[PDB]
Design a protein around this ligand. Structure first.
Ligand SMILES: CC(=O)N1C[C@H](O)C[C@H]1C(=O)N1C[C@H](O)C[C@H]1C(=O)NCc1ccc(-c2scnc2C)cc1
Lengths: 141, 86, 103
């Protein structure tokens, strides 16, 4: 269902990473499969060639944590006016304190050891319930 | 308008009422002081800092910084966030 | 510009914000509203330094980029019990436990 429209109309975009994370751009291809693209270090930008109606989202390349692009989940390149590129401001969401806590705990404890942690069962599930693109694609649909 | 949040070790954190209502658990404990027998001061100070952070950066175009969490307090802060639903 | 502060005395900590251009005295009015003690019974501090009523929080080193929402600056507070001021005493927060083995 969620897939890029095969418009064939070029659209230039600036991917601008105003997050402190390494950014993984993900293009949803014509059959809805996520295609990973080269990464952007923190604070960097790239002028890229995409197309009108194509779908993109952005993640942390290491952890797959979700990121926002122009304040939302999905970015769809639009028509270029006066030959100016479309800006895609990639930023950190305001994570819930819980989700932030989970990120930091995931970054310190190998997935083998989550069960050794002295916490309630549902938090162990929350830790193992990694941010995952496939899961988010189902939701958005 | 303020409310008082009291840590397990007796520290009294005084924050805006609207900030503390970020937490559904705190709303329910209020509906204006709340005692937290399981949350020590080094965790509840951070919780209060998250309120300030959340309120300041929710719906804002100005670039958003990372909310910092020392490794030493992360496990306890997780448990507190799960309890407080925030 | 907003600055984000923790005003602290003994085991009391007030989270609030003020303007960089606001004065020390004005911060005491804020404390007065919350703890019910007038400015003349309050001393405010940056670390060990006593702050003068007429100075701006900015002049006294509380700037927007150091007194941040997620990491607020600390302002010490002491009260006069009747005739003379108590000494500045800020109780430290509790110590985190040892990192578990896995961490
Ligand atoms: C026919 C068509 O549209 N295709 C066939 C390609 O297999 C994928 C797609 C295509 O050309 N796309 C999909 C997206 O709309 C972007 C566009 C594309 O691949 N442009 C080339 C490109 C190369 C590198 C990068 C990136 S992303 C981060 N750094 C770089 C250099 C972005 C775009």
């Amino acid at each position: 269902v969620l897939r890029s429209v095969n418009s064939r109309e070029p659209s230039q975009v600036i991917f601008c990473n105003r997050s402190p994370r390494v950014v993984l751009p993900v293009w949803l291809n014509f059959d809805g499969e996520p295609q990973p693209y080269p990464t952007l270090p923190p604070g960097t930008g790239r002028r890229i060639h995409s197309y009108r109606g194509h779908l993109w989202l952005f993640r942390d390349a290491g952890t797959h944590d979700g990121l926002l692009v122009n304040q939302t989940e999905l970015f769809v390149p639009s028509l270029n006016v006066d030959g100016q590129p479309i800006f895609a401001n990639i930023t950190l969401p305001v994570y819930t304190l819980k989700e932030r806590c989970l990120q930091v705990v995931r970054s310190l404890v190998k997935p083998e050891n989550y069960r050794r942690l002295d916490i309630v069962r549902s938090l162990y599930e929350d830790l193992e319930d990694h941010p995952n693109v496939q899961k988010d694609l189902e939701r958005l649909t | 308008m303020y409310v008082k949040l009291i840590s397990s070790d007796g520290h009294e954190f005084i924050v805006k009422r609207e900030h503390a209502l970020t937490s559904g658990t705190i709303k329910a404990m209020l509906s204006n002081e709340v005692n937290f027998r399981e949350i020590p001061s080094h965790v509840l100070s951070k919780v209060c800092m998250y309120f300030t952070y959340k309120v300041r950066y929710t719906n804002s175009s100005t670039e958003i910084p990372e909310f910092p969490i020392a490794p030493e307090i992360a496990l306890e802060l997780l448990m507190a966030a799960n309890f407080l639903d925030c | 510009m907003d600055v984000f502060l923790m005003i602290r005395r003994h085991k009391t900590t007030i989270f609030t914000d003020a303007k960089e251009s606001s004065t020390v005295f004005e911060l005491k009015r804020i404390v007065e509203g919350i703890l019910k003690r007038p400015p003349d019974e309050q001393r405010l501090y940056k670390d060990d330094q006593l702050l003068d009523d007429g100075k701006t929080l900015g002049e006294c080193g509380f700037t927007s980029q150091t007194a941040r929402p997620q990491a607020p600056a600390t302002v010490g507070l002491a009260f006069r019990a009747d005739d003379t001021f108590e000494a500045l005493c800020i109780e430290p927060f509790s110590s985190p436990p040892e990192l578990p083995d896995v961490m």
